[PDB]
Amino acid sequence: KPRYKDPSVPVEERVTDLLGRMTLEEKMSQLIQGDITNWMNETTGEFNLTGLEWSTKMRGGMFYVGYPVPWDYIADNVKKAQDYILQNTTLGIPAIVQTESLHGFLIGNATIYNSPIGFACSFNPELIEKMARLIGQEASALGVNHVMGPVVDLARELRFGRVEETYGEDPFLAGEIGYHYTKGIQSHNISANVKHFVGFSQPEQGLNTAPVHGGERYLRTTWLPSFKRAIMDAGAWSIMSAYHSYDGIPAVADYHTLTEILREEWGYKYWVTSDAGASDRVCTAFKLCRADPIDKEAVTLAILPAGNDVEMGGGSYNFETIIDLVNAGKLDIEIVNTAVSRVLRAKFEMGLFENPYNAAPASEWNKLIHTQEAVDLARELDRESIVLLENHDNALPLKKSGSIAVIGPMAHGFMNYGDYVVYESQYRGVTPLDGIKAAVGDKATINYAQGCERWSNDQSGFAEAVEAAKKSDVAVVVVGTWSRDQKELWAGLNATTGEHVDVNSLSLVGAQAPLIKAIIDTGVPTVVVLSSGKPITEPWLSNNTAALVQQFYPSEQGGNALADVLFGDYNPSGKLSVSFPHSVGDLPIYYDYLNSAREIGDAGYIYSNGTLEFGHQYALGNPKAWYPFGYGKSYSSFEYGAVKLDKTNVTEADTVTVSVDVKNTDATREGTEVVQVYVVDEVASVVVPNRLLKGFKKVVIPAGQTKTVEIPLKVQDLGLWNVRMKYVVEPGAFGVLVGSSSEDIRGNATFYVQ
Amino acid sequence: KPRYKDPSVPVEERVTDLLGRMTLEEKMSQLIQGDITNWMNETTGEFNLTGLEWSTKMRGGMFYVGYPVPWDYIADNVKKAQDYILQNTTLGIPAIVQTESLHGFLIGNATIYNSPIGFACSFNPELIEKMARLIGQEASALGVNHVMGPVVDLARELRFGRVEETYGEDPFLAGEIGYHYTKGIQSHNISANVKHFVGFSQPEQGLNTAPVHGGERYLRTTWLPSFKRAIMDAGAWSIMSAYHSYDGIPAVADYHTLTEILREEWGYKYWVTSDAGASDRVCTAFKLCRADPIDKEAVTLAILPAGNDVEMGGGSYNFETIIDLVNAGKLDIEIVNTAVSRVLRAKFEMGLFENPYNAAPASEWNKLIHTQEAVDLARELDRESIVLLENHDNALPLKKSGSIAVIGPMAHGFMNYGDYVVYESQYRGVTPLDGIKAAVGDKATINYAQGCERWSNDQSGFAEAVEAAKKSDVAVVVVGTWSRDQKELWAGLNATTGEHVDVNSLSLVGAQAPLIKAIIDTGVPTVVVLSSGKPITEPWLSNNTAALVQQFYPSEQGGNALADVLFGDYNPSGKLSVSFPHSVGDLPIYYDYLNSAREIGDAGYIYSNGTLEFGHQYALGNPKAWYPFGYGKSYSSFEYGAVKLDKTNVTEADTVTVSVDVKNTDATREGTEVVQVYVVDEVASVVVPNRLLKGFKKVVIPAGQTKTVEIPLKVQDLGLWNVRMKYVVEPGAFGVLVGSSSEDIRGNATFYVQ
Ligand SMILES: *[C@@H]1O[C@H](CO)[C@@H](O[C@@H]2O[C@H](CO)[C@@H](O)[C@H](O)[C@H]2NC(C)=O)[C@H](O)[C@H]1NC(C)=O
Ligand SMILES: *[C@@H]1O[C@H](CO)[C@@H](O[C@@H]2O[C@H](CO)[C@@H](O)[C@H](O)[C@H]2NC(C)=O)[C@H](O)[C@H]1NC(C)=O
Ligand SMILES: *[C@@H]1O[C@H](CO)[C@@H](O[C@@H]2O[C@H](CO)[C@@H](O)[C@H](O)[C@H]2NC(C)=O)[C@H](O)[C@H]1NC(C)=O
Ligand SMILES: *[C@@H]1O[C@H](CO)[C@@H](O[C@@H]2O[C@H](CO)[C@@H](O)[C@H](O)[C@H]2NC(C)=O)[C@H](O)[C@H]1NC(C)=O
Ligand SMILES: *[C@@H]1O[C@H](CO)[C@@H](O[C@@H]2O[C@H](CO)[C@@H](O)[C@H](O)[C@H]2NC(C)=O)[C@H](O)[C@H]1NC(C)=O
Ligand SMILES: *[C@@H]1O[C@H](CO)[C@@H](O[C@@H]2O[C@H](CO)[C@@H](O)[C@H](O)[C@H]2NC(C)=O)[C@H](O)[C@H]1NC(C)=O
Ligand SMILES: *[C@@H]1O[C@H](CO)[C@@H](O[C@@H]2O[C@H](CO)[C@@H](O)[C@H](O)[C@H]2NC(C)=O)[C@H](O)[C@H]1NC(C)=O
Ligand SMILES: *[C@@H]1O[C@H](CO)[C@@H](O)[C@H](O)[C@H]1NC(C)=O
Ligand SMILES: *[C@@H]1O[C@H](CO)[C@@H](O)[C@H](O)[C@H]1NC(C)=O
Ligand SMILES: *[C@@H]1O[C@H](CO)[C@@H](O)[C@H](O)[C@H]1NC(C)=O
Ligand SMILES: *[C@@H]1O[C@H](CO)[C@@H](O)[C@H](O)[C@H]1NC(C)=O
Ligand SMILES: *[C@@H]1O[C@H](CO)[C@@H](O)[C@H](O)[C@H]1NC(C)=O
Ligand SMILES: *[C@@H]1O[C@H](CO)[C@@H](O)[C@H](O)[C@H]1NC(C)=O
Ligand SMILES: *[C@@H]1O[C@H](CO)[C@@H](O)[C@H](O)[C@H]1NC(C)=O
Ligand SMILES: *[C@@H]1O[C@H](CO)[C@@H](O)[C@H](O)[C@H]1NC(C)=O
Ligand SMILES: *[C@@H]1O[C@H](CO)[C@@H](O)[C@H](O)[C@H]1NC(C)=O
Ligand SMILES: *[C@@H]1O[C@H](CO)[C@@H](O)[C@H](O)[C@H]1NC(C)=O
Ligand SMILES: [Ca+2]
Ligand SMILES: [Ca+2]
């Protein structure tokens, strides 16, 4: 009766006991990711015994299952791998079973949620938790016990294709969503995988995997907080390191971050895996070792002792040299023992040794995956993420009567899903046209015209769209950006966002802007919906359209969510998770810019009639955000009262509770406001962010009513990184700005730390 | 008689002896910059004795004289101030007398050289050293003994207004020019002032004075080298600190850079001044102290102990609190003593105590300022700076016969000088039209038409320009960017470059691009001259025009220099000091990007007929340079032979001499080539720049001849900053790429450090 098999033994002793029975071959197997296609034929589902035997022995710790195959292919072949481990190895160390979950379990016919950049606009972490719980239920049904999220990278470089996968530009909002997502996932004993550690998403020129310029203060002030929350407070069982270098140290091989910060400072107890092919990049991209033939020893010696425990597939499996390095005396066995211990500790705490089998039987999968509860939530979370940017003269909400033109490439014909969806997803779900026709039924005439193809400058379709508008009371035009599913993205089909699709312009592509102009020029009131994965730069829309709506990449319920807002069944409540610049020329545009940035001189202007008004910052443009972080309108108006703090003279150990009464001055409808609290460290020892979101509350306010909003500020969380790179909450004044966006401040107060 | 007065006493002993005789008031006075307008009325020249007494007592160490006044106002009032020091103070500590010299002594009717971004394209540091010697002659004539250059900031942020004041994007080229400029100046016992220390010219969003994101590795690898050469090798007697923060530490208050690096590592022996109002910024922009009323103590305590010795004017003279701080026990007298000592030591080394008077008599100024030698050099250096970008079917050089159209806002009507020119400069000098007319005399008909105004979208002028082209055999169109003199710049007149004039676009402004198209459509062969202070993004010009010429902001001889190239009296020899992007959306674009950057996937393309071809990096654009660093054509072709190294197995103490024979295959013309040597550290312990200019040689090769070019590489200069932030030349292979640009490599070799 080996002690490691006994659940009454403390976890640390179970780890010790198991580790001391393991051969070096078995230890290495734990640290190298396998793949379900080592024993499962992706096209036929046929089983290859020899490949399972090899995979288990050589890369047996964990394996990837993110293939677009039938449900039973995943479940039956995961089962065979777990049964093989249990019945046909000495030690029976259960496998971690890994797929993607970003905005839904990555398998066909599972529930697709709106993209992360969008659900961040909900400012509704509780609802995002509920999502993560239902995602874990779907994944769990087929035998998955690990998912490759959350992404707690920040949208700080708008040209980068993966903006959509983030929770926005702000550390606090991302950290809070990260925490909730992780909690909802791990509530099922499914491992989260907090990614991409660390400082990944500000690549040079916006290019996928390109290196990042920045210093240690920026890393600790802005990049690291969102990881800290998911890791330290939500107890994430795994982390993925990143593809980039940060001031010239590769993320995958950074001892300072992966060991000194992650373990010595934060006490992280579990494992870090590389990204996919990230280990080879040490030689191939970064040129820190010989690329041909690849110096597998050198790669291993760079990343494993740095604290990157596990090598992901997609590369050359450089970690197969661990045995040789140990025999040569070049790698201390204790480094291997620490990495293995981290993996085993996660497996014990996940419960895998007591319950290695996750999956439900085939007869139950339809009762666990794509449930009405999941579909309903997708629509709820989607509708709560929609951001009203403009609404002139009560154009919205639309009346469910008369005639309505529905125009534009994104209105119909394909679902405008973000990246990290499975092949052929785009052929199912609710389009804006579907949604709008469902909401009006027989009460309004709908006149649909495609208008243009998103990927073409061709204006053949304009006449039909102009005609549709001209015979309608109002026009809805749906344009934006597009991405691709996991097959089409990597086959090279055209895209304007997604992993490895980066842009040098944020303006509407192809004929989409000219299509809007042709409709507006009919004089019919035109509502423009932006359907997209990042900011779009078209400032002329704000005041030349009747209304302007942002729906970041939808859920499978997107068109219903959208029509719920358009016709006013739901009073829009989204706030921007990411700042909108006037031009790609104006980047970066994050709201949390250090003092001395952004607001410097006078802006120039180009008028549409040709007149140039010359300024300084810039000569002929404006570095101020077109729309700021936290911006979002309502059909209802909100009047804030005086801001109150419960305590004014405080200590670094205190909590200051911010209070404010918010009145819904609309007498006819309920409205939801997101009250946002920004902290300003007024006078600091080093230069700090001008203002930082440090709390918020989304509240539903009945018509004509006043609601008391209370938001706590833990003083310990408002510090900075001083000249000695120590975290301190320096004595002195802290401003508290309370408002409806990062710019729209409605009241303020000041407290003093002593 | 006191030891400090005796030239035979060692300098450190002279400093000790003098410092020991100074009151704390006299010490304070050395560390605070005065201003000649404290005793000279700017408009009348009247002397104010009271104001000289006060300036001398309170801010008497050094004073500024950069006012647009007659020569005798400067000379007579400088004399008054030096005479007052000598005869009417106890100690007779001569004043340092400061002005600007960026591309010419900053006084009316002195020689104006081309702007620095242009003269860097000459790759001729010896000629630039000649320029700095003549500049010092001109300055010295009026009693100036300190000039506020060189700028050794790098043009790494192309939106930033002061790109034109830099020597380009490359550390090595900027370092070499900085060295030579410093040496030229100080050959006259005139102090250089190396600026802006350090990391200033990559401001966030390209906005003037905005903070800079970067780590210490980037700072040491890229930003600091150019400072090192001027300071440590050329012996610069003064430094100016910068306006920015770097990873959140203000440059003005950074102990690590100003003291640890500059003194403890580099052994710098002299003084550092703040920039203008840069002291107040500590409270006002950076928010590190109370702004109102400004906390003068806190400013002083932040910058003086950090190693910023001298407070410049343009602020609140926070240093007047030095005395109170010493009295309160808050500032150690030894800090002040160190700072004063730094100033005195410079003054002793400059020879000021033996020769405090610089100036020549009134009757000689016309023989010392704006001499034929200076005017000729301005034309020679300007012509050597012109970069031929394209030349199809031998459109260039032009014949001095037939008819020639000269078109565009920059062809005539004003001189397109860069910034750091004195009020009303723009009304003197040779315009392109002036130069072209002088060059052809009666041998060709010149058909001039303005075409458009640079600051306007109005196309009224096009028909006249079109007519001018149509009645000519060839058309020359001069467009680009424009700046302003020191008065008009700060009065707010319109500009597209210069200090506090930043841009969010690099496309030709106003009617300029459409002007070009209108002329081209004429079918007359069209040569475009870009007349500008930074890259312009118009890729369509390369193959839609007959030829394409870059003249960065001209000298007062610009039009002659331009005509010298256009008509082929000079075979153009310039090479780009800064890389040209396709679009402002593609930034940054420096040639020395870290491995893993820039070269990542496939580029898309927008055809002029509207067809879209979608790529990845970027979807619809190209992150590769339109023209790279070091790019420049000639009328002549050059054929490189095999590259040879004199040594292959070397150590860090050795020098490797690169040799290659370059043949001028042109049978009719002499031609000048700039041979460029880029070093590649093949395998490194940390990520490094992909390639780095480490040597070059500009050679004149007679028609048909072959010339041996030898370029030395000191191995000690080819190292990196490792993970412990130590500079190391790591054993292993170094690639040597020899070519006509950073991209056009014609030969290579490898040596091995042991
Ligand atoms: C079943 O699995 C094993 C995987 O081990 C496969 O064996 C490999 O065969 C390929 C090509 O034929 C060789 O490149 C590899 O070296 C082999 N790998 C090993 C470790 O043996 C086998 O081909 C698979 N068979 C089927 C039908 O899929
Ligand atoms: C997840 O894992 C833990 C560890 O297996 C489970 O906790 C055990 O729960 C079992 C119930 O079968 C109990 O008998 C043990 O007392 C618990 N052990 C510990 C350490 O708490 C937990 O139930 C699992 N949770 C879920 C949702 O599956
Ligand atoms: C962008 O991708 C789409 C596919 O989504 C391409 O459209 C297909 O193109 C071929 C014609 O070459 C047709 O046979 C298909 O019927 C088209 N499919 C659809 C859904 O329309 C499109 O051509 C691509 N565009 C560009 C410019 O690359
Ligand atoms: C001559 O010099 C003194 C400068 O010391 C001038 O006096 C100043 O007067 C101004 C305004 O008139 C006051 O604001 C300052 O406080 C004075 N400074 C000091 C310390 O006295 C005097 O105005 C000058 N006279 C001229 C040029 O006419
Ligand atoms: C620059 O200053 C130095 C120091 O004052 C000058 O050198 C001195 O000149 C005298 C004779 O005039 C020599 O006998 C001394 O030995 C020199 N001293 C040193 C330290 O070298 C120098 O000539 C001046 N140079 C110029 C161009 O004016
Ligand atoms: C840009 O600056 C020029 C000056 O260089 C302005 O033109 C001047 O405009 C003033 C004021 O109306 C006139 O009195 C001058 O006669 C103009 N000078 C010239 C050369 O015409 C010009 O209007 C400015 N343009 C803009 C759009 O700001
Ligand atoms: C202008 O035309 C030249 C010649 O066609 C282009 O240079 C070529 O660029 C292609 C890229 O497609 C290279 O693969 C060729 O090897 C180059 N050929 C030569 C002879 O240089 C150039 O790119 C065009 N410039 C622009 C701005 O479009
Ligand atoms: C899967 O099966 C098909 C045919 O049955 C075969 O062509 C394909 O190559 C197989 N792949 C692997 C890796 O076994
Ligand atoms: C999804 O259901 C659709 C129904 O047409 C079907 O084509 C496909 O086989 C299903 N996918 C999975 C993974 O069950
Ligand atoms: C695994 O072990 C069981 C015995 O417990 C055995 O019956 C079965 O044959 C084994 N399977 C394989 C694939 O070796
Ligand atoms: C639209 O108009 C409002 C009201 O005048 C104004 O404040 C806002 O700046 C305008 N937006 C744009 C993008 O010009
Ligand atoms: C164009 O608009 C500007 C902006 O108000 C105005 O001053 C100017 O006079 C207008 N010009 C024309 C040509 O209408
Ligand atoms: C907080 O502190 C100041 C003393 O520094 C005191 O004057 C003030 O009344 C206190 N305010 C509150 C709200 O207790
Ligand atoms: C210079 O003198 C004129 C009188 O000619 C006067 O108007 C002006 O104020 C004076 N400037 C100063 C600084 O005293
Ligand atoms: C420069 O020369 C012109 C004469 O052409 C004169 O107007 C001006 O006053 C002179 N400036 C100086 C500083 O000598
Ligand atoms: C300076 O000292 C000289 C020499 O004694 C004296 O003649 C002169 O009057 C003084 N000048 C001033 C302005 O005080
Ligand atoms: C537009 O130019 C592209 C370049 O190949 C071509 O494929 C397309 O057909 C052109 N359109 C025209 C002239 O049909
Ligand atoms: Ca503070
Ligand atoms: Ca090396």
Coordinates of all heavy atoms in Angstrom, one line a residue, chain A residues 68-72 107-110 424 428, ligand 9:
Chain A
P68 N -10.8 19.1 -33.9 CA -12.2 19.3 -34.3 C -12.8 17.9 -34.7 O -12.9 17.6 -35.9 CB -12.1 20.1 -35.5 CG -10.8 19.9 -36.1 CD -9.9 19.6 -34.9
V69 N -13.0 17.0 -33.7 CA -13.5 15.7 -33.9 C -14.8 15.5 -33.2 O -15.2 16.2 -32.3 CB -12.4 14.7 -33.6 CG1 -11.2 14.7 -34.4 CG2 -12.0 14.8 -32.1
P70 N -15.5 14.3 -33.5 CA -16.7 14.0 -32.7 C -16.4 13.8 -31.2 O -15.3 13.5 -30.8 CB -17.3 12.8 -33.3 CG -16.6 12.7 -34.7 CD -15.3 13.3 -34.5
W71 N -17.4 14.0 -30.4 CA -17.3 14.0 -29.0 C -16.7 12.6 -28.5 O -15.8 12.6 -27.6 CB -18.7 14.2 -28.4 CG -19.2 15.6 -28.5 CD1 -18.6 16.6 -29.1 CD2 -20.5 16.1 -28.0 NE1 -19.3 17.7 -29.1 CE2 -20.5 17.5 -28.4 CE3 -21.6 15.6 -27.4 CZ2 -21.6 18.3 -28.1 CZ3 -22.6 16.4 -27.1 CH2 -22.6 17.7 -27.5
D72 N -17.2 11.5 -29.1 CA -16.9 10.2 -28.6 C -15.4 10.0 -29.0 O -14.7 9.2 -28.3 CB -17.8 9.2 -29.2 CG -17.7 8.9 -30.7 OD1 -17.9 9.8 -31.5 OD2 -17.6 7.7 -31.0
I107 N -14.8 22.4 -28.8 CA -15.2 21.2 -29.5 C -16.5 21.6 -30.3 O -17.2 22.6 -29.9 CB -15.5 20.1 -28.5 CG1 -15.4 18.7 -29.1 CG2 -16.8 20.3 -27.7 CD1 -14.1 18.3 -29.8
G108 N -16.9 20.9 -31.4 CA -18.0 21.2 -32.1 C -19.3 21.1 -31.3 O -19.3 20.3 -30.4
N109 N -20.2 22.0 -31.5 CA -21.6 22.0 -30.9 C -21.5 22.2 -29.4 O -22.5 22.0 -28.7 CB -22.4 20.7 -31.3 CG -22.5 20.6 -32.8 OD1 -22.6 21.6 -33.5 ND2 -22.4 19.4 -33.3
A110 N -20.4 22.8 -28.9 CA -20.4 23.3 -27.5 C -20.8 24.8 -27.5 O -20.9 25.4 -28.6 CB -19.1 23.1 -26.9
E424 N -15.7 25.2 -38.6 CA -17.1 25.3 -39.1 C -18.1 25.9 -38.1 O -19.3 26.0 -38.4 CB -17.5 23.9 -39.6 CG -16.7 23.5 -40.8 CD -17.2 22.3 -41.5 OE1 -17.5 21.3 -40.9 OE2 -17.3 22.4 -42.8
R428 N -23.2 28.1 -37.7 CA -24.4 28.1 -36.8 C -24.3 29.3 -35.8 O -23.2 29.7 -35.4 CB -24.4 26.8 -36.0 CG -23.3 26.6 -35.0 CD -23.5 25.5 -34.0 NE -22.4 25.3 -33.1 CZ -22.3 25.7 -31.8 NH1 -23.4 26.2 -31.2 NH2 -21.2 25.6 -31.2
Ligands
LIG9 C1 -22.4 19.0 -34.6 O1 -23.8 18.8 -35.0 C2 -23.8 18.9 -36.3 C3 -25.2 18.8 -36.8 O2 -25.3 18.9 -38.2 C4 -23.0 17.8 -37.0 O3 -22.8 18.1 -38.4 C5 -21.6 17.5 -36.3 O4 -21.3 16.1 -36.5 C6 -21.7 17.8 -34.8 N1 -20.4 17.8 -34.2 C7 -20.0 17.1 -33.1 C8 -18.6 17.3 -32.7 O5 -20.8 16.4 -32.6

